[PDB]
């Protein structure tokens, strides 16, 4: 498993069980109700997905796109971005917005 | 800035760190780019004054002088759109890019 950082989630990393990303004030929570909240900027955001499904998680693929399952792998949710095979982050960014950049283009260390 | 990211349009100032547990890229004042505990470096070392890290539209990293002039580039580019360079908690500075998906939760509509 890849370690943990509080405002990132790397492709193959996993948010559940109110499991969340935090930036400044902004936090991004995947939680026990199935509805991914974004609490900050202005607004906030959500899925809006709240009962739809049980113990449902979080995960970016190796594609760029962000997916919510539920426990039987049913999705719940997606954010419908694909893109080119390859390594992808979601980055709770300070000014508010999450988003989704990819694939690694360029690397220090192989 | 972010503390361990750098977003195309942002510049990572003269003795500026980004940092991520361990690792930590530091933007020296002797022009030199160092990832500390990744074992890299730009080998940039005493090439100017004032130095800066910024990332262009297309993501590619780029090191300027003082005076703007460039002393050191990733070569590696794409389209033109948002990029950033991510300092990964496995020890390697990594850029990703274009942008795929955006969450706003700043518009009223």
Known sequence: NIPFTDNLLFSGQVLYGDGRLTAKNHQLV?????????????????????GNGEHCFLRLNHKGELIIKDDDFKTIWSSNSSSKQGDYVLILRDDGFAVIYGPAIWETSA | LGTNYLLSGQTLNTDGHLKNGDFD??????????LYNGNW???????????????TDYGELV?????????????????????????????RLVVFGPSVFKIDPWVPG
């Open chain 2, 63 to 91: 090191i300027k002088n003082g005076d703007g002039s460039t002393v050191w580039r990733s070569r590696a580019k794409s389209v033109k759109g948002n990029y950033a360079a991510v300092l990964h908690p496995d020890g």
């Open chain 2, 41 to 55: 470096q730009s080998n940039t070392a005493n090439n100017g004054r004032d130095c800066k890290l910024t990332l």
């Open chain 1, 30 to 50: 995947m939680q026990g109700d199935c509805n991914l909240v974004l609490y900050g900027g202005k607004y906030g955001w959500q899925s809006n997905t709240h």
């Open chain 2, 25 to 34: 890229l530091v933007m020296q004042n002797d022009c030199n780019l160092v």
